[PDB]
Each structure stands twice: as C-alpha cells, then as structure tokens.
C-alpha cells in the first residue's frame, strides 16, 4: 500500500515535467495499475493537474489576440483532456470501485472546491454508465443549487461580501464545459442534455421567496445548457427538440412557461431546426386539435419564428388547421380559429408557391398577388362562418380582427362587412325605439348563458374603424352614423329599457343571472362609446357632455350591481394614457372649455385613474394588457411612461372613497414595481421620460417622496395618514433598490431613513414595521447591523422592563420609532428575524472556513459578530416579553445562537493541534448569556379536543431544544479544553436544573 503510494506520487511529479501528449499514455498505465493499489490518489491527482492546467490556460487566454504567451493551445488541451476522460470512463466500466471513489471524492452544504470544468466534464461522461447515471446527475443538480444559494447569500450582504474573495460558480463552470465540448467531446453531450432537463424539471415554476430566486437560476441554467448544446451538437438536437415538445404538447395544464421560452429560442435557428428535426414539429402540429385552446395559442406563438421563414411549415400548419375547420368535433375548431388568426395577423403572404406513386413536381411559377389575395380572402370567409359559434370563439375573432386588419390592408373591406353584418343582428335601426341594442338577442337560454359579447363586438368595431379612417383613407361613413346613433339613444335611454334599478340581480335565479350578464354588456358598451366620443369631433364640448352622461349611465349601473353583491375595462391602454394626460395636464384655451365638463365630475376622476391602475395590475399579473396593442412591450412601456408622468405630476402638484392623490400614489407604486419586474433594461429610459445615470435620476425621485413623508410625519397623530405613509415607504423601498450601494446617493438614503427612525414616534405598528424593514434592507447592504440590532434590543428592554421585577432598566431611547406599543410584537419579532440572518451568515463562514482546511481575518470578524450578537441576546433574554410568539422566537433564536457557537468551537477543535479573542468570546457567553438563559426559562414557565393536545405537545419542544443546545455547547467546550490544554469551563458556571412541583 505504501509502495504503490510512492510510485504514483512520483509519477504525479512527472505530470508537470513530461510532455502534454505523453500524459494520456501515462494515465492509462497508471490507471490500470491503480486496480491492485490506491484508487483515490490516482483520480485526485489527474483531476488536480488538469484543473490547474485549465485554469492557467484560461488566465493566459484572456487578453488581446495580438501576440500572447500561451503555454498549451486550446486545441490540443481539449484533445488530451477529452481522451483522458474517456480513459477514466472506460476504467470505471470494468472496476466500479474507481467510479465510487470519483463520486465520493467529488461529493458536495459545502463549496466543493474540487469541482472544475475538467471534473464536471468528467462527471458528465461518467453518466453514460447506467449505474452511475442517476447518482452523478443528482450530484450535479445539488452543486448548482448550492452554488446559486452561495451567490445569493453573498450578494445580499456587505459584511459577508468583504470577507470572501470571489470564487467561480458551478453555473459558470458548466457553461464553459458546453463551450469546450465543441472540440469533439461527444461523450459529454448526452449527460449534458440530461442535466439540463433535470434542472428545468426539478426547478421549473410551479405557480399553477428566499428559495424561489435560486430555483429560478437553476432552471435558467438548464435552458442555457439545452440551448447552447442545440447549436453546437447536430446529433443531439433532435432529442432536445423531441423532449422539449413532449413537455409542451400536453393537456395536463402543468406550468410550461419555461419550456415554451426554450422552444422559442431553439426555433430562432430555423434552418438549424429544419435540417435534422422537422418531423417532430409536424407530429406536434397533428395533435393541435386535441390540445386545449390555451396550449394551442401559446405553442403557436413559440414556433412563430420558424413559421416566419419556412413555407413548408406554414403549408403544413394550414393543411392541418384546414382539417380542424372541417372537423365536426368541437373544441378543435377553436384551435383552428386560433391558428388562422395568429397566422393571418402575422403574415401578409400565405400559401404555397400523396399516394404510393404520387410525387410532387417543382413547378417554377412566379408568386401571384391575386392568388394570394383570393387565398387570404377565403380564409376570412371561413372565419366569418365561425361568428355563429360559442361566445368564446366570437371573443377570439373580435380580439383578432384588429390585428388582422392592421397586417393585411387588403382584408380591411372583408373585416368591416363581417363586423357590420354582426352589428346589424343586434342594432335597432329604428331612430326612436329604445334601447339602441337588442340585449335579449345576445343571450342563449337552454341555464342562461351569454351568446354574443356585444360590448366586445363594439370595441373591435370602434378600434378597427378608427384605424380605417386614419390609415387607409390617405360602410365607414355609415359606421360613424350607427355609432353616433347608439351614442345619442343610449344617453336618452331611461335605464329601464334594458329591463334593469333592481329587478332580481341574483346569482342563483335564472332571471337574476340574465340581468347580471346583461348588466356587464351595457356597461361595456358605455365604455366603448366613451372611448369613441373622445376622439371624434376632437375636443368639443357637446361630445364631452355625452361622455359624462354615458359615464353616469355606467356608474349608476355599476353602483346598483356593487351594492346588491369584477370585469376588465374595455378602454385601451393608449386611450387611458391619452385620457389621463388631457384630464390632468392639458392647458390650451380651446381645450379648456370642453374639458371642464369632464374635470368637474369627481367620480369621472376616480374612474379614469382606477382604470389606469387596472391596466398596470394586469401587466404585473399576466405580463400583457387586455386592449389593442396589449401584447407589444414597446407600446406598453411607452404608455407606462405617459401614465407615470401624469400620476407623478398630480401627486406632487397637489397634496392631500380614497382621494385622487392617494390613487395616483398607489398607481406610482405599481408602475415602479412593474417596470423593474418586466422592463429591467429600460430603467434608464423610463426615468429619462420623467420631467446622468440611473442613480442620479432615482435619487431625484427619491428626494421628492422623502419630502412628502416628512409632511405626514410632521402632522399630528390623529391626522397621520397611515395608508399614505405605508404606501410612501413602499415607493421608497422600490426606488432605493435602484441606487448603487457604493455611491453618495445611497448613503443619503440610509442616513435619511436612520434619522426618521430615530426621531419619529408614530403609534401605528404597520408603519413602524415597514420603516424598520426599509432601514434594515438599506443597512445590511452597507455594513453589518449587529450594532444596530444591539441598540434596538436595549430599547425593547427599556420599554418592556426586566424579568427580575426588583432592578430598574434604564431607557436608552436610541430610536423613537421603538415605543411602548411597537416594542412588541413588532420590533422584537423584526430584530429577531434580522439576528437570525446574521447567524445564518456567520454559520456560512464557519462552514466555508472549516471545509477549507485567509483564516486570520475571517476568524476575527466572526468572533466580533458573535461578540456583538451576544449583547443583543443578553438584552432580550432578560426582557419581560409577552407570552406570544416573541418568547417562542427568542427561544428558537437562542438555540440558533448556541448552535453557531458550537460550530465555532468545533472549528477550533479541528484547527487547534486558542487565540485571546476566542478566549473572551467563550468567557463572554458564559457570563452574560448562559446564566441568564436559565433565568429566562424559569421566568417563561412560572408566569402564565384533539387540537388542544396538539398545541400543548407543540409548546413542550422549544425549551428542551435550548437546553440541548447549551449542553451540546458545553460538551464541545470540554473537548476543546482538553485538546488545547486551557480550561474553558472556568468561565462557565454549573448548569442549573429545574424541578416541577405541583401546588
């Protein structure tokens, strides 16, 4: 055993001396020799040599392509690595002990510094052995997740970030394994594809906080792995596309959003897809009829880049979709309607340019515009026949005709005749009969349901007509006449001609359900005509008086339905942005006289702002907006900028159901959250459109909201607008995330929040909780909050008193926000959560530090953190906390405090073959924490169906858990006192025990 150890070790010396091309011959002989001798040292040496060899090559490769000092060229380096990996893999196929050593050597929570691009590529090729397939792939999955947890933990702390020099991450490591796999590493791809699918299956979004972000990163890595492997390796792409389509083409209604983005990215290389894997798309197209409507629309939008460039795929899609049209089975014509709508709103040119002995002939015929127009018109005629189907099918067509009419201008006439004819079925052309529309004809009774979305039909007509009269001009003269007729007759309607103040309006009776459904249609019609009368005749008084009367018709029926007991607004986002701008910040004498009609109605102000809030909320929930151009991120972003400017101006210009200014502040909070969530790269352009860098513009907005909060605080307690103050802090919290922490602007935000917390003593607990959470979020990214935590504990101790009931605790009054009512359970629960974060950071250092063996600077910082956190706990362990969750959380946190102390002692137990600071920390814990923990336990216990048994058996855990933690700590202090020959138990008193004795 010793003799074979020397011969291999001497050969590892030859690794750095012998030529690179000579290594693989040496490895094979030394690997097979390892069968009868040492096994771990053989694999560890090969892995260590190439890990440093690759690292040295990476360092020297970076730089200009001008003359460089390169030892090993990348071409031969990947060749020797690739053939040596195959040598190791072949050895495992005959040994099974070398493979177990490799997994055990590369076992991961710990950073696992032995992981490298060479070792990861070695592990991936090992997965070709079915025995080690699941075992190795589980190792790689755990490594990336832990690596992302480490990355998230470092970025969220400044204390932790200073002490840890940066290290590479497994996610970065695997990506360059894919990059290096181009050099004939075909033995890696199969395990590389399997790992990418495991990462995306195990950590895909299951929507159907702390751990959600690292899970999203692991899923993204799988998509990056699968996408990059698709481009490089031609023989694995057909398996990637087939597996991707398997998770997407289902009726299981499982969350597949991540899979659809990967499929959309793969088909961006359409010629790359058509060359090898094109049948998989065609078989997927065959199942489109059986898929649900939601799946078909999302699947077709994913393979849209493929359809844009390829004629055969469009021909295959049309061929399949045409069958679904003629298919008698329902729920499949719905997918055909979606297929034609998506295909007709995106492509101006459609159409092409068999039996056993039937072949296709390449006819060289020029493209005919007339033939294409006839082809497109025939499809629209097939869509017109679908306006007699279920209300769901009509809804898609109304939403889709506007996009179709904007893409294909030749079909504009077909749309209007199709739309006008449908309106005639419900429009009363008699110039004096009321109501203007036959609301009973839109209802299907068989159970009373809705047959025709008449309000959505009018919305499509109004938008399509508006586009018509401004685009194709440089039926239409009759469409304005009808809409004008509907406008006037709806206003003079007495709200009884609809058979609607309260007849039944119930949710169970048939007539009640019909009235509720009919109530939505008339309100939706009012919204559409409000949009219509705004643009026509420009800013004329008479039309605006008709909007207010139309709104009152909508508002009155909205009130009656709300009080007895919703739906989206039919206004487009562009109109809401345009309406708000004129309604608040338009100053032109011609416009002023007409706009005074709309500005005088306060309820119209509520409606206009609230609809804008609805539009923003749809963006956050869904990612797109309901109205026209509601799935175009560029136009949504432009509308957010204009809406923000109006809401920002209104809130700042005039201070204060809810008032208009409060509504504008509420909308501002949603927009800031929505902009950062979706339009992350447009933040500089978003802040630019409000009237340097992101930090300078953000600070200007931040200081604007800072002054507003100062005015609320400066007022009296009864006048303190709690709702606005919390909403202001939410705005400041979101904006402060944009500042760079290493900047004078960030320091001012931290310095302003600290001053507010130290001087204001509001009685509202929700405001205090939000303000302190802002202070701690800012502070943690600046420095360790242990000093801040220690000062807050002294305030909680001062207000709530001491458990001794015979000594007086002096009131520090470090922060005025920590008053007698907010001290518990608001500040106490808040600081305990922050101290729990501090312990999780320190315990991460010790784990990283212990597994490592700069041991000197990290040890001092850890001891300094635990030394300060001891004083924080020393204050709370002798506070008369209420019997609720404050005691339970402190007991659980004290257990975490002692667990971390034990982990530190066990570290020095491993290293001591004891500095003065560690001496003082052990002495400090035994003089200020341990004796007072026993006093707290006595304090807590003395003062005071099947679920009752559960509650009492749950209450019996926390105190024994702490006693175990203290005794476990003193056990390892005895072990350290023996190894280090210094008695650490002289600092510790004797353990105090309790005896129950019933009265």
């Amino acid at each position: 055993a010793e003799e074979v150890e020397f011969v291999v070790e001497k050969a590892l010396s030859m690794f750095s001396k012998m030529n690179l091309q000579e290594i693989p011959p040496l490895v094979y002989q030394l690997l097979v020799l390892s069968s009868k001798g040492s096994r771990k040292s053989v694999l560890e040496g090969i892995i260590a040599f190439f890990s440093a060899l690759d690292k040295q090559h990476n360092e020297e490769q970076s730089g200009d392509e001008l003359l460089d000092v390169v030892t090993v060229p990348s071409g031969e380096l990947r060749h020797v690595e690739g053939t040596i990996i195959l040598h190791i893999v072949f050895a495992i196929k005959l040994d099974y002990e070398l493979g177990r050593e490799l997994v055990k050597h590369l076992k991961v929570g710990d950073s696992n510094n032995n992981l490298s691009p060479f070792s990861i590529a070695l592990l991936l090729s090992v997965t070709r052995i079915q025995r080690f397939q699941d075992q190795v792939l589980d190792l790689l999955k755990t490594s990336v997740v832990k690596s992302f947890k480490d990355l998230q933990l470092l970025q969220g702390s400044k204390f932790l970030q200073n002490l840890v020099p940066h290290r590479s991450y497994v996610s970065t490591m695997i990506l360059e394994v894919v990059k290096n796999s181009v050099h004939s590493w075909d033995h890696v791809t199969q395990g590389l594809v399997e790992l990418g699918f495991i990462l995306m299956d195990s950590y895909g979004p299951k929507k159907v906080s702390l751990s959600r972000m690292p899970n999203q990163h692991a899923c993204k890595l799988g998509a990056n792995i699968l996408l990059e492997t698709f481009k490089i390796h031609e023989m694995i792409r057909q398996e990637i596309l087939e597996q991707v389509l398997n998770r997407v083409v289902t009726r299981a209604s499982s969350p597949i959003s991540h899979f659809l983005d990967l499929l959309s990215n793969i088909v961006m290389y359409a010629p790359l897809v058509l060359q090898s894997c094109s049948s998989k798309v065609t078989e997927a197209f065959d199942y489109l009829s059986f898929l649900p409507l939601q799946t078909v629309q999302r699947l077709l939008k994913a393979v849209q880049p493929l359809l844009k460039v390829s004629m055969s795929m469009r021909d295959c899609l049309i061929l399949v979709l045409r069958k679904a049209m003629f298919a008698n089975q329902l729920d499949a014509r719905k997918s055909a309607v979606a297929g034609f709508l998506l295909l007709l709103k995106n492509f101006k040119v459609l159409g092409s340019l068999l039996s056993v002995s039937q072949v296709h002939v390449d006819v060289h015929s020029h493209y005919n515009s007339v033939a294409n127009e006839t082809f497109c018109l025939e499809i629209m005629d097939s869509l017109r026949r679908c306006l007699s189907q279920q209300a769901d099918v009509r809804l898609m067509l109304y939403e889709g005709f506007y996009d179709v009419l904007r893409r294909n201008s030749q079909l504009a006439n077909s749309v209007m005749q199709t739309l006008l004819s449908q309106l005639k079925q419900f429009y009363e052309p008699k110039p004096d009969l009321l109501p203007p529309l036959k609301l009973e004809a839109c209802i299907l009774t068989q159970k009373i349901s809705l047959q025709e979305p008449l309000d959505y039909l009018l919305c499509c007509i109004q938008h399509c007509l508006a586009w018509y009269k401004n685009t194709v001009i440089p039926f239409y003269e009759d469409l304005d006449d009808i809409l004008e007729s509907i406008t006037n007759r709806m206003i003079k309607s007495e709200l009884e001609d609809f058979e609607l103040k309260s007849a039944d309006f119930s949710q169970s009776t048939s007539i009640g359900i019909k009235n509720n459904i009919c109530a939505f249609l008339v309100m939706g019609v009012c919204e559409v005509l409000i949009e219509y009368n705004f643009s026509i005749s420009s800013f004329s008084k008479n039309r605006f008086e008709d909007i207010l009367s139309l709104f009152m018709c909508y508002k009155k029926l909205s009130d009656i339905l709300n009080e007895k007991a919703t739906s989206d607004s039919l206004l487009s986002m562009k109109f809401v942005s345009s309406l708000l701008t004129a309604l608040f910040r338009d100053s032109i004498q011609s416009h002023q006289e007409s706009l005074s009609v709309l500005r005088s109605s306060n309820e119209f102000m509520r409606y206009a702002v609230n609809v804008a809030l609805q539009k923003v909320q749809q963006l956050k929930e869904t990612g797109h907006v309901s109205g026209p151009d509601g799935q175009n991120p560029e136009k949504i972003f432009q509308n957010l900028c204009d809406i923000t400017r109006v809401l920002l101006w209104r809130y700042t210009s005039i201070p204060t159901g809810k008032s208009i200014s409060l509504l504008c502040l509420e909308g501002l909070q949603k927009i800031f959250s929505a902009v950062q969530q979706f339009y992350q790269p447009k933040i500089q352009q978003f802040l630019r459109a409000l009237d340097v860098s992101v930090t300078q513009r953000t600070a200007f907005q931040i200081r604007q909201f800072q002054r507003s909060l100062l005015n609320l605080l400066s007022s009296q307690e009864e006048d303190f607008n709690s709702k606005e103050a919390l909403l202001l802090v939410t705005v400041l919290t979101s904006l402060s995330k944009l500042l760079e922490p290493s900047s004078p602007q960030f320091v001012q935000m931290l310095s302003w929040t600290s001053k507010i917390c130290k001087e204001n003593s509001r009685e509202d607990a929700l405001f205090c909780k939000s303000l302190m959470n802002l202070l701690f979020s800012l502070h943690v990214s600046y420095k360790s909050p242990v000093i801040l935590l220690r000062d807050l504990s002294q305030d909680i101790h001062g207000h709530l008193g001491d458990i001794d009931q015979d000594v007086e605790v002096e009131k520090t009054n470090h922060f005025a926000i920590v008053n007698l009512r907010t001290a518990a359970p608001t500040v106490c629960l808040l600081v305990l959560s922050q101290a729990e974060k501090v312990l999780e950071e320190v315990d991460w250092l010790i784990t990283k530090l212990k597994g490592q063996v700069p041991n000197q600077p990290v040890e001092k910082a850890i001891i300094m953190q635990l030394g300060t956190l001891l004083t924080f706990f020393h204050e709370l362990v002798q506070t008369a906390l209420p019997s609720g969750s404050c005691v339970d959380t402190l007991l659980k946190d004290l257990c975490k405090m002692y667990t971390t102390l034990t982990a530190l002692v066990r570290y020095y137990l491993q290293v001591c073959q004891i500095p003065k600071n560690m001496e003082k920390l052990v002495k400090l814990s035994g003089s200020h924490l341990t004796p007072l923990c026993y006093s707290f336990i006595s304090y807590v216990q003395n003062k005071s169906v099947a679920t009752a048994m559960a509650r009492v058996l749950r209450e019996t855990k926390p105190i024994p858990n702490l006693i175990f933690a203290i005794e476990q700590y003193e056990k390892f202090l005895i072990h350290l006192s023996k190894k280090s020959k210094v008695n650490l138990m002289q600092h510790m008193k004797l353990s105090t025990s309790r005896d129950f004795k019933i009265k």
Binding site: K93, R131, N246
Partner: protein, 326 residues
C-alpha cells in the same frame, strides 16, 4: 356537453365493458381515455384498470395497446395515474397479465416516469405482489407487444440486477431469461451483451448472478447461444478482475456450450477453446498458467462426462497430458 350528462354516458360506456367484442375495445377505450379531466383522472383510471379483462384475436389485442400507447403518448397524468392504481393495490390476486404489460408500456413510452416505475416495481417484487408465474404468463401469451420494447425491458432488467435483495435480483435475472426466450435474434444478442457487461463489471453479486443466467440460457437454448459465443468468448480478455471461483464457472458455461451439439458450429468453438487454454497453460505469467489449469480441468469434465468413443477418450486424455506437462 353537460359534464353530468357526459359522466353518465361514459359510466354506461364502461358499465358493459366486459360484455363487448374484441375489435371495439380500442375505439370504446379511445373514447374513455380522452374523456378524462384533471380531477377525474385518478378515479376513472382505477376503474378502467379493473373493468378491463382482455382475456385476428392476436392482432386486435395489439391494436388495443396501440390505441393506449397513442392515448398516453402526450399525456403524463394518465400514465402516472395508472401506476398509482397498481401501487395502491395490495393483493397478489388482483395483479394480472394486463397489469404487467401496461407497466412496461409506460416505461418505454414516457421517459419522465423511469424512476417512479422502478421504485414501485421494487416494492411489488419485494412484497411478493409480482411473481415468476405472473411474469412467465405475461411473456408467454403477450410477447408480441413486449417484443417492440426489448431495449426498454433489458434496461429495466439491468437496473434490477444492480440491487442487493435476492427477490429483486432473481426477478431481474428472470427478465433476462424470458427476453432471450421469446424475442427475436437481435434482442437475444442484446441479452448476451448485457450479461457480458455484468460479468465484466466487477461486482461479486452481479458476476455470480449473470454467470448463472448464462448457464441457464445455454442449457435452455444452446442453438441460440451457439451463435453468441463470440461475445461470451470476449470475457476471457478480462480475467484479471474475476475471482478464481468465477473463472471456474465462466469456463463451465463455455465448455458446456461448446460441447452441447456435434454440429460444425460447435467444432469451431471446441477447437477455439482448446487453443485459448493451450496458450494459457504455456504462459510465462504464473496467474494465467493457473487459469489454464482450471479451464482445462473444467473442459475435461464436460469432455469426459458420462451420459464416449475412443477418439474422444484419447482427446480428453491428451488434454490432461498437456496439463500435467505444463
């Protein structure tokens, strides 16, 4: 249609499922499987598991499974719901041929359930739910549908053989033997190639078990193993990581296969085995000299086994004279 009205007609559809003909079984089931919602999946599939008996007759059964394979091809929930029905069952009597056939179909068709099928299979075998007779009956009468997925079955058999429980190991060995017996020539070569990998793996448990399977295959079907001798001969190149006890067994199966028949194919292997040992007996390496003695004594046992002409008697005698001299 009305969900309640659709439920009632589907219940009547499955009510008389036993009394219907054979050719309509695909289309009637084709209706039911698509007539499944998210919540109703578990309850419907459990009924269909028991309401189905299955006891152009050979073709229509294949058509039935072809419909099911297409029906669950894009449906993971239905495939997963089938296994839950089998997992919940705790009585051996309920398990039938149709039960085992479906469990293999889900394995081959959908790869997202490889692990879940494996874990449940271990429990059923270990608890005695799945028996040799159920496996024997499954292959015997429904090898037409199983033959399509011989690669999938052998991957399942190979994984079962890596276990540490004799019940699982015995079943995995049986899965190898039944695949060799009922499938075609190409999948038989896969069976032998899979066994050779186990013998060269290094595990004492796998090498011992795989050698027993090879001996059973030789005794059962010497003619089929006769043309697979090239791969079996390849194990002789990896005698370094094989114990002397297993070397004796490896020579026994090689010797009993070479002398099973008197055809011209055997005579090529017989003289091939003589020369392999002849060049091991004379090897300067001492370990291979001992391997030659073990192999030559083993061959002489089959050579002189009593059930022998003079020319055979002098041939085995000459082999012993060679071993004595070396």
């Amino acid at each position: 249609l009305d969900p309640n009205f659709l439920l009632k007609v589907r219940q009547l559809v499955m009510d008389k499922l036993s009394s219907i003909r054979l050719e309509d079984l695909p289309v009637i089931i084709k209706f039911i499987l698509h007539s499944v919602t998210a919540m109703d999946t578990l309850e419907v599939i459990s009924e269909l598991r028991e309401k189905l008996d299955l006891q152009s007759g050979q073709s229509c059964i294949i058509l039935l499974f072809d419909v099911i394979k297409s029906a669950i091809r894009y449906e993971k929930t239905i495939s997963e719901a089938w296994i839950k029905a089998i997992e919940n069952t705790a009585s051996v009597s309920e398990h039938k041929v149709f039960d085992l056939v479906m469990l293999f179909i889900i394995y081959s068709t959908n790869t997202q359930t490889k692990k879940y099928i494996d874990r449940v299979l271990r429990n059923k075998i270990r608890s005695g739910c799945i028996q040799e007779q159920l496996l024997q009956s499954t292959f015997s009468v429904h090898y037409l549908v199983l033959k399509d997925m011989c690669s999938s079955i052998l991957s399942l058999a190979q994984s079962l053989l890596h276990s540490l429980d004799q019940s699982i190991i015995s079943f995995g060995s049986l899965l190898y033997k039944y695949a060799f017996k009922f499938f075609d020539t190409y999948c038989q070569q896969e069976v032998v190639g899979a066994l050779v990998t186990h013998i060269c793996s290094g595990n004492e448990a796998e090498v011992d078990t795989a050698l027993d399977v090879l001996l059973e295959l030789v005794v059962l079907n010497p003619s089929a193993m006769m043309m697979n001798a090239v791969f079996v001969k390849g194990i002789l190149d990896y005698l370094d990581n094989i114990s002397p006890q297993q070397i004796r067994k490896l020579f026994y199966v090689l010797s009993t296969l070479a002398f099973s028949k008197q055809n011209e194919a055997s005579s090529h292997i017989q003289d091939d085995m003589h020369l392999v040992i002849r060049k091991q007996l004379s090897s300067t390496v001492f370990k291979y000299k001992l391997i030659g003695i073990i192999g030559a004594v083993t061959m002489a046992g089959i050579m002189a086994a009593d059930r022998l002409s003079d020319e055979q008697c002098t041939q085995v005698t000459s082999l012993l004279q060679l071993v004595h001299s070396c």
